[PDB]
Amino acid sequence: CPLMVKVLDAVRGSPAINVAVHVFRKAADDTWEPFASGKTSESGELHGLTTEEEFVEGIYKVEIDTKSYWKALGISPFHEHAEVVFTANDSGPRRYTIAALLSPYSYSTYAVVTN
Amino acid sequence: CPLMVKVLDAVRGSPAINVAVHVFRKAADDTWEPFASGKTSESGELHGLTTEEEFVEGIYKVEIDTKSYWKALGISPFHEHAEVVFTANDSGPRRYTIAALLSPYSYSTYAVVTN
Amino acid sequence: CPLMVKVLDAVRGSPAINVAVHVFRKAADDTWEPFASGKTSESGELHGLTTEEEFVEGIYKVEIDTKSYWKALGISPFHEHAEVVFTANDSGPRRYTIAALLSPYSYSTYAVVTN
Amino acid sequence: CPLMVKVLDAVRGSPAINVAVHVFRKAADDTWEPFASGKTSESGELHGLTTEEEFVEGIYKVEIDTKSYWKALGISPFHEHAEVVFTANDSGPRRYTIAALLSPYSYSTYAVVTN
């Protein structure tokens, strides 16, 4: 599991469950190519998006579909999405945890990168 | 104005208005002595807490009364208050802005220290 | 000034100065069209990006060029940029402040929407 | 494990290791009584602070000794401590994860509360 996404709801103090996550990788033509996607579990985590073989060096974008999450809770939020754009594996393979803490008019994102 | 406090509401996307703020200074007996207090304005800011003369080097605590703010909005919060403890240090002229971004189960606090 | 961008540096406790900011508007072909851009001032703020006339309802993206900011300071960052995607909605008069608090491996973004 | 503390370093994108954590509980005389303490592990987590029997209803303060952590990394930070003050178990026993994301001039704290 070289890439994991974790999403927390800062209004309820709970994992954000069933949040759609789309990962893209920048292609040589500079466009965003679909790479992997999934939904967060009951723990607010999304495991198994990729493998060490497929997760090569590159620029990746993790799009967390926060607006659909808040709309299902009856909240009209500010953001469409939370986006996390980063270069991965440029100094060799690493394990990445991308976390997002959500509120209707704010989000925080952090990364924990381990070798 | 050497010390200003700013509070933002991440649920409503607005300044957090009428939030009580208490500032304390650590005494020689290691207890916290009341130093200044007020309520945030319509802009979520609290100005005029102290003066350059009174705001000497020392350890200060800013307590932002977040629970009463959320309860007034009908929202169940986690924290009793947001706390910011810091040492004021003279290293040329300084102005301190202590900011807090609030959500019911999370807060971020930052300081902007300028000359 | 219906749209303002503010950027803060959580490592130095200062406004993030000379940060490039690019604003885009979603077009009918679903691509992102350049809309406005600038660099943050000495106060970490970027004013005058647009006018009430031009800033119509639509989906906007604010890209804050955080990686170039950290690299100029000699700090190894995680993100390529901080991204803020939102819909501008007319529901009475509105002023949008898009803020970003930056650290090398994390950022918080919030919006203050006032009348 | 009804109470766990997790600390992350937002400058390095790593767990914050060997961070001292002190927990206090408000006594009937309104003073803060020592309750539990420990140091974060290699994963930035602190487990085993208390038991379901000992972690009764009350107001608790989690003091994370951030200044000593940054000073060991050669950084003179703004805050003395990160403090998290909350009422626990007032609607019956709950499991609490108290997380803190650290930077030299800012900290964010969130809680994940599960039944």
Author numbering:
A (entry chain B), B (entry chain A), C (entry chain A), D (entry chain B): 10 to 124
Which statements did the authors publish about this structure?
Transthyretin (TTR)3 is a 55-kDa protein that aggregates into amyloid fibrils under pathological conditions. In its native tetrameric conformation, TTR transports retinol-binding protein and thyroxine (T4) in the blood and cerebrospinal fluid. Amyloid aggregation of TTR occurs by dissociation of tetrameric TTR into monomers; these partially unfold into amyloidogenic intermediates and self-associate into soluble oligomers and amyloid aggregates. Here we identify two segments of TTR that drive protein aggregation by self-association and formation of steric zipper spines of amyloid fibrils.
Therefore, we decided to disrupt the capacity for a steric zipper by strand H by substituting residues Thr119 and Val121 with the bulky residues tyrosine and tryptophan. The size of these side chains is expected to prevent formation of tightly packed steric zippers formed from amino acids with short side chains such as Thr119 and Val121. Aggregation assays of TTR variants showed that the mutants T119W, T119Y, V121W, and V121Y did not produce aggregates after 4 days of incubation. The side chain organization in this peptide also explains why the residue replacements T119W, T119Y, V121W, and V121Y impede TTR aggregation. Because residues Thr119 and Val121 are pointing to the hydrophobic T4-binding site, we cannot dismiss the possibility that the tryptophan or tyrosine could strengthen the hydrophobic contacts to increase the stability of the protein and delay aggregation. However, the involvement of these segments in the formation of TTR fibrils was supported by two pieces of evidence. First, peptides with Tyr/Trp substitutions did not form fibrils in isolation. Second, the aggregation inhibitors targeting these segments hindered TTR aggregation. For additional evidence, we synthesized and analyzed 6-residue peptides containing the same substitutions, and they did not form aggregates or fibrils in isolation. These experiments suggest that strand H plays a role during TTR aggregation by acting as a fibril-forming segment.
